[PDB]
């Protein structure tokens, strides 16, 4: 539910203390109380049923956008744009090559968003950030 935390099962109505805490590894509607419950002792697996991804308490954050897919796309764009930051001044005014660079960075962002080529793109971005 967009209003209710499935892990602790508490409504917004009679308990307005819950918060929209999400995890970049796996985006789950989990309140701050459940986060301070489970992951304060240590890293654990995702309390959502059907998911078992490891996750950390300090990596938790609140979701800015209502849509989960848009939020993860923006987070992936943040994780790419920090190292992928060539500008038109980096290209010495070459507009066509800058547009090709924009196409390439949007394509690798899309690939990381859908996970179709996650291994090769991840290796490429590691090799790019090592410079």
């Amino acid at each position: 539910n967009k209003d209710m935390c499935p892990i602790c099962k508490t409504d917004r109505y009679l308990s307005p203390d819950v918060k929209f805490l999400v995890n970049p590894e796996c985006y789950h509607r989990i309140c701050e109380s459940c986060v301070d419950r489970i992951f304060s002792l240590g890293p654990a697996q995702c309390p959502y049923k059907g998911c078992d991804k490891i996750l950390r308490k300090n990596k938790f954050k609140t979701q800015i956008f209502d849509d989960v897919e848009v939020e993860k796309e923006v987070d992936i764009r943040k994780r790419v744009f920090n190292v992928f930051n060539k500008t038109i001044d980096d290209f010495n005014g070459d507009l066509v090559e800058y547009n090709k660079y924009l196409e390439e960075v949007e394509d690798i962002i899309y690939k990381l968003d859908h996970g179709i080529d996650v291994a090769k793109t991840e290796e490429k971005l590691r090799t790019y950030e090592e410079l």
Binding site: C8, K9, T10, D11, L14, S15, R37
Partner: protein, 184 residues
């Protein structure tokens, strides 16, 4: 009648059908059908006894589902008695229901938090619990077993954490059952 009155009638019906027995259901449904009842009214409609309605009236007064009016009148035979009138105060009753369910879920959450604490220990001879903090001050010279302060017995582990998932599942099974109440 008023749809909001229908909603509060269904809410009181659901709470008395869920958290109360059949006689309580009959009493509250009698009040929800016939708005104000006296003792003889309920006794005639339900064929119930004065001591039989005793715990029912006591519980719905303590839980504020039924209010009482101490009006005495003057019948033409002049054999007047100070009769009591049973009726419902809807906002007070729904506030009492709200407070009761909120304290139930908060107490269950606090019990879940106490179950999130590690297992600890309990000495079976003395039947006294021992937390993990006080176990270390009571360990042996061999650094192997925790011994009791009085019984001097090796401590055995409690179950604070093993039933934590059980308490969470109890909370989940409470939550979907109370869902019509929160919807109301």
């Amino acid at each position: 009648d008023r749809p909001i009155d229908d909603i509060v009638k269904n809410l009181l019906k659901f709470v008395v059908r869920g958290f109360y027995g059949g006689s309580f259901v009959l009493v509250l449904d009698a009040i929800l059908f016939h708005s104000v009842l006296a003792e003889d009214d309920l006794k005639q409609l339900l064929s119930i006894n004065k001591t039989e309605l005793g715990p029912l009236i006591a519980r719905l007064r303590s839980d504020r589902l039924i209010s009482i009016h101490k009006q005495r009148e003057y019948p033409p035979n002049s054999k007047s008695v100070e009769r009591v009138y049973y009726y419902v105060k809807y906002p007070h009753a729904i506030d009492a229901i709200k407070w009761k369910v909120h304290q139930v879920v908060q107490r269950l959450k606090d019990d879940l938090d106490k179950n999130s604490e590690p297992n600890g220990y309990m000495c079976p001879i003395c039947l006294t619990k021992y937390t993990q903090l006080e176990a270390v001050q009571l360990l042996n010279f061999d650094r192997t077993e925790f011994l009791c302060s009085l019984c001097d017995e090796p401590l055995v582990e409690d179950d604070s954490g093993k039933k934590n998932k059980e308490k969470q599942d109890k909370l989940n099974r409470l939550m979907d059952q109370i869902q019509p109440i929160i919807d109301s």
